[PDB]
Design a protein around this ligand. Structure first.
Ligand SMILES: *[C@H]1[C@@H]([N+](=O)[O-])C(=O)NC(=O)N1[C@H]1C[C@H](O)[C@@H](COP(=O)(O)O)O1
Ligand SMILES: *[C@H]1[C@@H]([N+](=O)[O-])C(=O)NC(=O)N1[C@H]1C[C@H](O)[C@@H](COP(=O)(O)O)O1
Lengths: 264, 264
């Protein structure tokens, strides 16, 4: 995508070399914002094939509050395997905090349901927020949430969403992170009878790993294609009732897939 | 400031009218980012006088973990009066979460001290984050945090910081919110022996209240002045040991103050 390649180019031109947790080494910039009007098309990267099965199943898995990888395996998705313990557990990551953030006084808070209530009863509210950054539980997590905090916004009958992502692996993560949230926006707007508006991505430490340099130069030589169209076939009873096959991505014609090593 | 007036102009040209919690009505945009190189000068608005006493004392008050307004009153700062209960209490807002976020298992976490430890021992970490958005306690707060979540970043010997602000009152709030965080950056870099880098501001629902329209047109006719210089006179033992008079703002020559009604 246009915005995606401009970002890739910017890290190459303007990033400073940095050490990082993994030992891999990176080129990194700090702070960047991109806007996607979800009306122009579904923001799925076309300059390499992205694995939709994985993107979609992760989202469904988040919406369940499942933090164990068994559901991913039943569905042949292995993108979380490097970080699970032998029981296949990741600790109270994403979905646990979305569905059941633990309070100090014993309760559990379902932010997703909270958010549908706000969008159904108080669309102008400026507090329509989901956070994964539960400070009290970071140390139980296999990995701190990279996509940490997001806000919904309604104006003129359209649903918008902004994501704060503290740490972005531009080559491997960002293409999923974008498709994934764009999906949630479509699902949420459907549930709430809204049009889709913009998805705004905001990054903190936005980086390209040092052993993604040939892959990056390869993808930047590619010309982007027309964006696909997302079709949801059925309107489920609830945001928690989507099935993988309710989604149709039509007109998706990427350049070939490009393999790159994961930073563990 | 340049970036500040361009933002003000953008909400006027591009905002949609919105109802809001207060009943006031606003022009609102969603998602905007501005960068301030803290080396070019201290980003204190010059097109109207800003009350430094208030900006500084609020920050000091946050660093204490005080959520009661008594400390502000001892120091003649009344910017929190509209929201306190009769005992002068605001609930577990900003400073409570910065200094003593309560865990579900009984503990309290001091994110500020956590952050100095990360900056002193692991500057490349991409998890140097403070959050005020404690979901478990939002309902105890007099007001949900507007400036909710912020991240530090070190590269080339310089300290940077990005703020996610879910709700920005552009006329009244933003000029404080910016001065205030720019201050924290200077304090933190001093404590950590770093140079100041950039302060990056990221907004969600970024708005101009409808009864700030004449004030806004008035301030946009003003020409911005040279930015002041911030001088810290002493290097205290700790981030918690700053006193109001350790700070000198030199070269600050604003246009006159402009009064506007607070949205309660
Ligand atoms: C993290 C990631 N995730 O864990 O799901 C994601 O969704 N997107 C990412 O970009 N992602 C990256 C950012 C970073 O390169 C590593 C996490 O490392 P730290 O930032 O050191 O925690 O994964
Ligand atoms: C909120 C504020 N604060 O409570 O300290 C601040 O520091 N900056 C703000 O801009 N500010 C504004 C945003 C909004 O206009 C109101 C809060 O209202 P909700 O967004 O409806 O909670 O104060």
């Amino acid at each position: 995508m246009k915005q995606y390649l401009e970002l890739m180019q910017k890290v190459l031109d303007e990033g400073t070399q940095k050490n990082d947790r993994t030992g891999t080494g990176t080129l990194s910039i700090f702070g960047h914002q991109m806007r996607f009007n979800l009306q122009d098309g579904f923001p799925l990267v076309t300059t390499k094939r992205c694995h939709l099965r994985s993107i979609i199943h992760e989202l469904l898995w988040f919406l369940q509050g499942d933090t164990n990888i068994a559901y991913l395996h039943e569905n042949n998705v292995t993108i979380w395997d490097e970080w699970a313990d032998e029981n296949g557990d990741l600790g109270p990551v994403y979905g646990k905090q979305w569905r059941a953030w633990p309070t100090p006084d014993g309760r559990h808070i379902d932010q997703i349901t909270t958010v549908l209530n706000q969008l159904k009863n108080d669309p102008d509210s400026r507090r329509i927020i989901v956070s994964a950054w539960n400070v009290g539980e970071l140390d139980k997590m296999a990995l701190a949430p990279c996509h940490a905090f997001f806000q919904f916004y309604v104006a003129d009958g359209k649903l918008s969403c902004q994501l704060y992502q503290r740490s972005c692996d531009v080559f491997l993560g960002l293409p999923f992170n974008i498709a994934s949230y764009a999906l949630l926006v479509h699902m949420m707007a459907q549930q709430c009878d809204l049009e889709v508006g913009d998805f705004v991505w905001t990054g903190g430490d936005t980086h390209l790993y040092s052993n993604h340099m040939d892959q990056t130069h390869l993808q930047l030589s590619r010309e982007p294609r027309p964006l696909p169209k997302l079709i949801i076939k059925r309107k489920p009873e609830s945001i928690f009732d989507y099935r993988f096959e309710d989604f149709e991505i039509e007109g998706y014609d990427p350049h070939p897939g490009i393999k790159a090593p994961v930073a563990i």
